[PDB]
Amino acid sequence: GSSISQEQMNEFRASFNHFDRDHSGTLGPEEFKACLISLGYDIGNDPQGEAEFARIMSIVDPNRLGVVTFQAFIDFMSRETADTDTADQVMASFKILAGDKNYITMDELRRELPPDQAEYCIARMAPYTGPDSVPGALDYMSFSTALYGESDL
DSSP, rough: OOOOOHEEEEEEHHHHHOTTTOOOOOHHHHHHHHHHHHTTTSSSOOOOHHHHHHHHHHOOOOOOOSSSEEEHHHHHHHHGGOOOOOOHHHHHHHHHHTTTTSSHHHHHHHHHOTTTHHHHHHHHHHEETTOOTTEEEEEHHHTTTTTTTTTTT
16 A cells, blocks of 8 residues: 555656657656656756755665666655555555455555554445454455445535
């Protein structure tokens, strides 16, 4: 949980691919900086953008290679996306860990999003009372078609 959606990695890969027509797999510090703008970042020829870009280049390239890889900008994106989610990635992730069962426990889903994101998930996930049921059993498969946190929406 707390990660990229299918549509998110789509535009991330596409923008790096749009700017990196050489398919080197890496671009320069200015090229990748303008590549963020394509996603909606105010980081381009602005002194504030330069000030935060200075942080970014130090993370993706502490070796001062003078280049940034697709995976390297993702390394910091993973830190900023820590406190946010989308319905796509949260439902998708449960199926990976609960593919062994037909349901999820509150304990198991807390591994995916340990902060209050888990509590916000329990507040919508359908309850489970099947043969393998435990007091914290929730049917994640069911969540896709039914939720109760927004019953009056």
